[PDB]
Symmetry: D2
Subunit: 421 residues, 4 copies
């Protein structure tokens, strides 16, 4: 146990009275609205989102990085920290790895995961940066590089990621690359995309029968003029071209200003290509902020599309969910905790939507009542539900308060040496 | 017929002939030093055409107000007469695009007037984003994707009627742009609305002749301010792919999100054979509908760079339907359309100057600087002499607007047509 | 008088009274646990008012079309009658904002009708962004900043006329929003046009009563699509500062560039004493004019957070004018305004819940996570019971739209008014 | 000379004939337009823009940095490369320094500058990153940090930058900080700004009589929710509050999408607070791409406002122009060369605008002809003017071509050790 059980119990007891009052009050209010709070709590306690191994360390920008104390020294320390997030929130049982950052003996990774009670989600390849001993640089691209040998090298890297994933329990590979151009004319849009498609086809051939390949679009950064996989339109063409095992990953902060992201989600679901999500929040660009910290309603609206899919009876719909954020000015563990909480919060509210009433208002084109129907769900403070779900599953009623009460950060700060060079 | 007296055209051409010859010869020499035959460029420019919107020769407005000018066209016939001026002077707009019901009239007459004016008819445009007098079902909450079956049927019928009018006048395509969408979260179920849209478009597709095309046009927002069914090229692609070989996508420059790389969308659609055509205009904030190239000329060039790259790589079966789609709120509509058509040919001509072999080399070598400089060498070239010479050699005007103003046309039609009144927009 | 039958209000209130009592008491206990007196919050909420736009009572439209509903108001008097319903049910919109010349009519009759309906009048709104019948000079190329002196003079005169009408009905402010700008580079000389605008506004300020305020409203674009004279808050501040103590800036939520941090603009103006007022609405793309809070409710809360913080910091003489400015294109204008007024009070109420002492501590300690969580604890709170009780206690409806629909008001006016 | 004189002469003679033809042809066309090409050329050869010392090194993003060969390390290597840009373009005689990056003995710096034929422009302070041994971290801010000691440290740093500048010939201090927040509530907008103003007042007090203090606004990055100096409105408030010696710096890529930047320039000029403009281009965010490579007309429109003011000589109008870009996929020197070229190109074209005709069309509200009057100047290919100006002043007809013919990059590659072969 990363966090002492007596600490969790103590903090849970300190807040048990208040939780009871709020939960029972919300329960009665929901009952009057025709909703069974127990049914919602039962679903909420089973909603999981993967935690990025690279998210437990402090992030930075191209201008600077300001590390905190006890930064994880490697993947094993990172898994130890991810275990804290899972123990306290019980919403992050799985971790997403990034290769080569997390490269290590698969048997050891697996052993450590099992020991901490953590599993592994989709693998993430890295051909947007150069690793030591690389025969070819990814400066001008990787999977879509003009140089055949460079693409070949990138393909082999992704295949290696699949080999690592198979050994630790992963069932998917997420591919995000920086490929694109910074100047008009630098790249031939079509030829670069064709090159990408050919390389991804090779990677697709390396997929086990029960695996999935997720391509992730991004409007810009690191490429500032054009990006090969720039939006969901190109992403759909990729997935449709590759095959049944290929789907699209939607990262909230990767879209043009004012984009209606929830519609993109609906469109991908309709055509069965919604592979998964990368949750985070933003205001300007790919800010990678704590999910829901900026626009909680938008997050709720994305979940509204996910829940509606269930209501509509969409088959075989199991999108992969992962948090993909950068924590530059907070304790990474605390931000991941509250971010996981916001995601469950939006999910819970989406479950409260009176779909029967909504379908009626949609058919009668009663726009005002249709939107108010969504608002009645979103406006509901579901914190008591999230807290109870945690209490029942061995988590903390107030995760961050319990984390702080445990003195974990100070503990690891004394155990881990900060990098000097 | 000649809306503009030939003597005025000749007079104004001779007046600038000397200067033109000097500039054309200078550019010709420079291009020769660059291994380019100015004549080959001029020859292609003379043959580049862009359709003019019948509704573009009238003064436009916003939801706040409309400030009509003098001699506003009363209907399609006055509009065709004004369009004839644009074609006569620029020689770049031989075809007009009709919008129904605005331009509803006897097909025979339209065709007859067009032939007399030397104008053809491009893509037909349907209108289910507004209600017409005596209309049975309102399009307030949608049309082709409306929840009410009867409303969708009515919209479908309207589009089929547009195809019937087009066949009678020589058109070979239908362009479908609707305002369908929602202003509030929850108001519409994104998927169901799209399913309804797809089903209705399928019915319209069934009414297409074997040599016709059906163009769906995406738009991020307006009139819908929360979600729009056909919101972007992604949804538009799904539409074209689902409907069939005769269905393609139309790209309107000002219908994209801020900072969108529009030239890439063009390339992607060309790659998958779904680039039906373009709707030219410029913008800075939203769907501003400004004069093409008046705000970002380089972007217009970059879009044409993609068009010429395909046109040069022998991309078979590549005949995108180009059209100007603008709103002229503070200029004489005819003058704006004239210079807009000019800017479009300008971007086209400059795209033709690009050393494709050199560019390809720099792309393969990842020489980003030289690759971008290769495009700039073409873009920086002032091709106005080629544009002016092309017009002169084809019966047009060296300086179209100067000739237009010298003719006194606006004053003339102003005397022939009834006066208009300014007013507010649909805001209230 | 009462637009909505008093028996319908009592009926629809009694129908929901039991549930409200349960929700209000539960919220009261929760807030009590948080050291907050729910009664204190409700008291402030029932005192929060926002003006309703006369031009928002009718169905709005776009440059593509207008789809009116039934019983559309024929003029300002019908609009006042409809505004009376909004106030009767929400009790949050006692004042109406007029727009001249759209609402031109005998000022004396307007006041009389207002007094009879229990409505007051907020800031007057001038209109030199469209031409009126018989107008000598067109505003096509601008108004207060038009190159033609006679046109600027005419625009100034119109604004003074707006002040005359306002003085007769009890208005104490003039809001000036114009479309002046250019659609093409070179069309206007940015600086000279602004110099002309400043000179014309100086004339208006000269004729401004000493018990009145003058609000200039910035907008990034529309109707001008290349440049706009009063394009942002920076230019707006220069205007207010140049004109004088009685001149301030009006912030319309949908008038800023994509991704702009609007709440910061609000803070900056307060700090320099130039925040005159707000035009509330919501949006996603441009100046969409949608129901307030319908798209981004947190942003609305964050704007009010700055307003409540101004009081907490001890800023003096801060009494911003609040006004709804929306276009209802696909809903019953009355229902949208009702729920919009409600959303504004909702954001206000939540801002009142922020533990200022705790927040200040987290800010001083740079505890970003707890600071944001402190705002969230307030924002996540469902204050609907407070809003409903406030309405109930002041003669309004527990559920405004439900009571409105039960009254059959729309069908009624649909029969009294043309098609 | 960094570049051999014989190479410059050789590459000039190779292009002299064609240049003669083009220059004469343009001179004739301009003559028919009532314009004297010589008057334009004389002004162009005198238009200078400062080159950033940090611009000659290869740039990167938060994801990766792909260095090229012969990367300059330290201010001395950088000055050596900056000299190349000045010798070939003759448009960048002054270099802008950044402290503590370019820290060195002032006398030695001044000596190296004089030897290379380079002067020194505005000094640039750095409190957006932590230097080793630093007593207080700038993680949560600098000049506006809540901690008094931290603000004092940032103030002292800025004063030290002025001291360094006074010793090498600089006459201004540019202050751009990352200060802001990533979460609502994290900062109190007003108190943070009050702290900033108070700290800047302390810096202002240390300014010599002939020095200027430039504050730079930026919408976002590194702060992703709010930034203290977020736009020109706040920037104007700062300059007006501080005093006559304080002005605002406008960086093209630091504005919200669709912003009309040329108007901001005009407004600042009208109120005498336009301190300078930092050139670069962009399409998405603060891309820091080569000036005019994405939107050359916008660059021309900015210069239209500058030239209109330069013609009349407005009070307080004496801009301190600098290039501020990041070269992630090109030879930094080549990009800086062509960027300086684009800046002079836009300046030259603005010089061609018929102000009298323009003024007329503006007064008559003839929008079409007004915009056409600007286009007639913009559509003019002034390359012959830029090339001749360089030829007459000791520069190269075709800078990049001459640069590549000299083999300079290969030369420094052999003198400077890369991290890896
Ligand atoms: O942290 C880098 C990750 O961020 C991205 O979203 C790119 O910004 C990709 O998913 C990468 O894996
Ligand atoms: O005038 C409306 C036209 O504008 C559009 O671009 C919609 O904005 C469509 O093409 C319509 O046909
Ligand atoms: O309805 C027009 C109003 O909208 C505006 O916000 C302009 O868009 C102004 O405030 C006007 O008064
Ligand atoms: O390289 C960092 C420079 O970039 C900036 O524009 C910040 O983006 C500032 O001017 C800094 O000096
Ligand atoms: Mn991602
Ligand atoms: Mn990302
Ligand atoms: Mn269009
Ligand atoms: Mn359009
Ligand atoms: Mn407004
Ligand atoms: Mn508005
Ligand atoms: Mn800068
Ligand atoms: Mn910058």
């Amino acid at each position: 146990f990363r966090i002492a059980q007596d600490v969790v119990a103590r903090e849970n007891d300190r807040r048990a009275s208040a939780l009871k009052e709020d939960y029972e009050a919300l329960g009665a209010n929901l009952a009057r609205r025709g909703v069974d709070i127990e049914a919602v709590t039962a679903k909420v306690e089973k909603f999981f989102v993967a935690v990025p191994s690279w998210g437990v360390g402090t992030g930075g920008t191209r201008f600077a990085r300001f590390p905190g104390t006890g930064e994880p020294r490697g993947i094993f320390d990172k898994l130890d920290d991810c275990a804290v997030i899972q123990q306290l929130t019980r919403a992050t049982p799985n971790v997403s790895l990034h290769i080569p950052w997390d490269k290590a003996d698969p048997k050891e990774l697996k052993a450590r995961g099992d020991a901490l009670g953590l599993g592994f989600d989709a693998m993430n390849s890295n051909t947007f940066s150069d690793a030591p001993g690389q025969a070819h640089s990814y400066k001008y691209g990787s999977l879509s590089h003009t140089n055949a040998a460079t693409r070949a090298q990138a393909v082999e890297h992704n295949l290696e990621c699949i080999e690592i994933g198979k050994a630790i329990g992963s069932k998917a590979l997420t591919v995000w690359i920086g490929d694109g151009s910074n100047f008009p004319g630098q790249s031939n849009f079509t030829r670069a995309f064709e090159r990408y498609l050919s390389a991804m086809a090779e990677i697709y051939k390396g997929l086990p029968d029960d695996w999935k390949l997720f391509s992730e679009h991004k409007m810009y950064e690191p490429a500032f003029y054009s990006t090969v996989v720039q939006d969901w339109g190109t992403n759909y063409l990729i997935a449709q071209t590759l095959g049944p095992k290929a789907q699209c990953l939607v990262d909230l902060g990767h879209h043009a200003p004012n984009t209606n992201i929830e519609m993109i989600v609906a469109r991908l679901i309709q055509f069965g290509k919604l592979g998964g999500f990368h949750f985070n929040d933003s205001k300007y660009g790919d800010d990678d902020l704590d999910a829901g910290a900026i626009e909680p309603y938008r997050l709720f609206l994305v979940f509204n599309e996910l829940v509606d899919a269930e209501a509509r009876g969409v088959k075989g719909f199991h999108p992969a969910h992962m948090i993909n954020q950068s924590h530059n000015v907070t304790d990474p563990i605390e931000s991941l905790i509250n971010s996981a909480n916001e995601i469950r919060r939006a999910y819970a509210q989406a479950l409260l939507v009176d779909r029967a009433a909504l379908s009626g208002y949609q058919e009668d084109n009663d726009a005002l009542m249709a939107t108010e129907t969504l608002k009645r769900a979103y406006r509901t403070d579901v914190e008591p539900i999230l807290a109870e779900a945690r209490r029942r599953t061995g988590g903390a009623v107030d995760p961050v308060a319990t984390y702080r009460a445990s003195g974990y950060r100070a503990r690891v700060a004394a155990e881990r040496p900060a990098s000097v060079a």
